[PDB]
Write a protein that binds this ligand. Sequence first.
Ligand code: HEM
Ligand code: HEM
Lengths: 360, 361
Amino acid sequence: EQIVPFYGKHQAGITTAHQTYVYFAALDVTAKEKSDIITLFRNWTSLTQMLTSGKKMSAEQRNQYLPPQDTGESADLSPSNLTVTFGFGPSFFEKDGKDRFGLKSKKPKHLAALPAMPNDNLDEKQGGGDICIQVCADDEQVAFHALRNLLNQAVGTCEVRFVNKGFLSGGKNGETPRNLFGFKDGTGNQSTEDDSLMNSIVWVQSGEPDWMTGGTYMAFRKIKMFLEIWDRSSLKDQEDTFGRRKSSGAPFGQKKETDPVKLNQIPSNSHVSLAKSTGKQILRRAFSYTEGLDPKTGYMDAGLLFISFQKNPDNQFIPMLKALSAKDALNEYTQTIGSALYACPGGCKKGEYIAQRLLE
Amino acid sequence: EQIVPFYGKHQAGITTAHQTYVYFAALDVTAKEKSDIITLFRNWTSLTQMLTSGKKMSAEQRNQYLPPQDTGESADLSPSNLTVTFGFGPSFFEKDGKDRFGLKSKKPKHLAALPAMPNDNLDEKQGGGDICIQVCADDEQVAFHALRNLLNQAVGTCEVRFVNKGFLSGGKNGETPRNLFGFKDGTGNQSTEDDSLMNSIVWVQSGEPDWMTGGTYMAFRKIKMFLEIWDRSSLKDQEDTFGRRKSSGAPFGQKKETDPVKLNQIPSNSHVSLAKSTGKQILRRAFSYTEGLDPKTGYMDAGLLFISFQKNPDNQFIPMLKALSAKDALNEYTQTIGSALYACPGGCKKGEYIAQRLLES
Ligand code: HEM
Ligand code: HEM
């Protein structure tokens, strides 16, 4: 009953209401024939449809001497609005000059590594990758189960580049969820329920190969947040960093979270002023992370798995990166340590597989 | 609604129904006076009472120029049955041979580091600690918030040794939660609602310093689980490793999860056979963990944060540890990489602070 359709015009996990939990994986294809990639996406499709659907691998195992077909730890759990979203990095189309799989002619127009930015401190292994898998659910164990079982299918075809995970709880009464800086996160997104707006901001309708119709580009930035530096700062510093008030989420000088931002009443280098002043829009769908103590600092290693969706990242996304990178007050408390851009195919129809129209 | 009382005879987080998420941290005290420790435990007590009770810090602060007193990320969240449980390591009472805080005379009777076990691969920095804090909630953001705000208060008195976190979802209809090997985990525990059994297995009543009355000992083992090796194994090898059927959770030859184990029907070195044949009992309250890819293996780094509670770890826990470390079939699939034992104080009464009966003279 917490079931999100897998099949559709679009992949789920993009305009789908934001779940609590994410696992975010990137893989590199080690196989040499597009035929092996085809079988992988076919199997991934059939398994994703089962995992998200609420169907359970039912009463079975006729041969004790074989491994179970499923790892079993989601047996008693609800589907918890599980979505699984697939994308492909530039290196899937071309790696080191070689068109490894004969796909270059079906390359998306805007798929390239993101440009270097000031204050970047990228670990190459924490970004890029041929394929990304974004697994979301309202229950961590459900999302981990889905990733693990998808990844088990890729053995021999791909190597896993990295796996991150994160969380972001919505308010008990539907309030915008707060990031680890304690600020409402997502206010500035247009309504994911507004088809017109999602069409103009997220969804590909033209100018791209047909496998991208109903698809989008997914930007990923792994951004370390220095909680100890932030927590020791004044409220004034924290609000002046954003250009919104912390509790209310209101733009400075406004009453409500949803009041429009008045650019002339917020600091010119506040986060919100810089992002908004590009005049561009993206759909941000981020999750917080914590990964134990950072050994180099001896403080919590925490941050944001930044994930946004936009139909044209050269028009919509890269200008924001540019506008923020030098001037953002948030630069005091953050540092990007991983980066990637992926193209997300349009939705799968019942009886097709993911990226069928790309792989042919 | 989702509020677990903080004050009581016992600390919460022990017999409390198992929440979904945990953050588990250890701290070392760098302060030299016990009066600094008294301050810390006082503040932690006031803060935990506020975090667990559901009261929210008034949003409004006079003085825009000061840091907010609360980090704010839980402002809109339910208390989610938050519990915070404190314990103390052997090094709180004596470190490097020095009784730093004049506490040695109040040391618990069974508090010492766990003995080395074969197959151990301990990272010494992933074990031990003067102080453990176990923070549990049904929502990870709530748990992290609590830990963060508690650790923020310890700046200047302690250093954080390590922070672990974990999850374990119970079934939609209250079925026993499954661990990452897909097996029900906890069946062999006695009921947390049977006062009689918790009093005889978990809760200290005598033979210990007063401040331990109503307390217990907390065993911690961070156990890496090699999911890739496990997943490739036959169902027969997985079930033989434990001595219960995976799906039903029933002991071999039995129909139901709850049926008594028949020792003669499971392998001698099966996990359950070895554990049960010690004759001893503990309360296990473990969570699974995943920490991204293991750089040494290229596979998921995943495992169990094993946490158990017992009134006398020398009697109940260590023989179990010894019997399993030697012979458990489960060793094929796992390795212990962190280890601790802490003494957890009796509960806090309203108007008192945690460990007051230890720290005050
Ligand atoms: C740790 C890093 C980040 C944090 C903590 C953060 C936090 C926030 C907050 C609190 C707001 C105001 C409320 C809202 O609209 O959601 C906001 C707005 C926004 N952020 Fe960020 N942000 C981060 C990084 C980024 C990056 C890397 C970009 C894009 C390159 C970005 C783009 C935006 C945009 C477009 C808005 C909406 C501006 C508008 O009102 O039109 N943010 N962010
Ligand atoms: C390393 C990961 C471990 C896993 C995956 C694991 C898993 C299990 C499972 C599946 C069961 C049977 C269902 C249940 O009763 O909970 C079980 C029982 C048990 N385990 Fe473990 N366990 C682990 C480590 C340990 C350790 C270190 C100890 C004690 C030192 C321990 C003590 C027990 C006990 C006492 C029981 C119940 C036996 C009885 O029925 O009386 N386990 N465990």
